[PDB]
Design a protein around this ligand. Sequence first.
Ligand SMILES: OC[C@H]1NC[C@@H](O)[C@@H](O[C@H]2O[C@H](CO)[C@@H](O)[C@H](O)[C@H]2O)[C@@H]1O
Length: 345
Amino acid sequence: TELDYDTFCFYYDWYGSEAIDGQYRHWAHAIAPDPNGGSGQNPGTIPGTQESIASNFYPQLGRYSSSDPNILTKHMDMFVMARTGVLALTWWNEQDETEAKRIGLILDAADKKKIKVCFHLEPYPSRNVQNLRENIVKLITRYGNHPAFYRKDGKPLFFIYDSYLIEPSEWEKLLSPGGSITIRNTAYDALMIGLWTSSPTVQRPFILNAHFDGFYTYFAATGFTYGSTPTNWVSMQKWAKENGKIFIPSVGPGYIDTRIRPWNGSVIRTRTDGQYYDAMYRKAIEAGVSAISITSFNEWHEGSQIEPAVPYTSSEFTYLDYENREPDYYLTRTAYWVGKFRESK
Ligand SMILES: OC[C@H]1NC[C@@H](O)[C@@H](O[C@H]2O[C@H](CO)[C@@H](O)[C@H](O)[C@H]2O)[C@@H]1O
């Protein structure tokens, strides 16, 4: 029954409905050009109609709005069902007051069920260490006193997606104790969790020289990177422990993004009735880590979601579904692994 507060589930608040947002945002989505394709590609778009959404799966809740209070209550009950104590909220620096209202709604809904919220800092336009500092300050100032705001031993925690886009010489200005714009030992200090992608030869000095407090791996597809290859996790944890870093491996129930990335079929990982998820979660537990991240609650575009999905077929597409499992199976199976994680933590 207890929620686990070292289990972080990646959450996306970008979905819209006609009724609430005036358009089916994200259910409608651009199809991505092939990176190795020609020069003048015209991939098209997915309209976000009932028949055709930007996912290989279909949500039980339909084409929902992330701002719908009814949807928010349902998602928070699903977090409770999954025993996942922390919602890791995608954050794109939209800056409009709509973003603020939405974050406020999520924090209020989370706190009713004693869920905590931390921020997942995305590669927003012109992201750099100076505006990242400004934004961390704004987020802590604005939300740091909310009861649902996540802290570990007094410290806020931020996941930094695609952190490699900013060189360690830049990171050190923000994250070194002697950094020219440091947050260390200020009111705005936080646990900063960077993305580990490739081999230890590159990643080890990256993490040390950038002064991250920890690292995560994000990708739900096993083998996509060195960091998302679970057999590496024991050795990654031993390095983390040796160097005083927090390792938060990411586990997911599967992966498929071919509706929006039709050229990306080699990254597909089938769910095989839960067997994929079991194998990956088990590997994280066996690595003896102190925290786990789940990719994802509701990244519907990438087919990594544990949110309940239903069978559905339209003239546009035959959606995948949870096969010989109920719509809520990945929630309850998450709860099962969280219990196992807790027993040996
Ligand atoms: O949260 C980290 C990372 N997760 C996978 C994606 O959600 C990615 O965003 C990119 O891809 C999505 C579609 O899957 C697209 O909507 C978004 O605009 C891209 O930035 C995200 O950064």
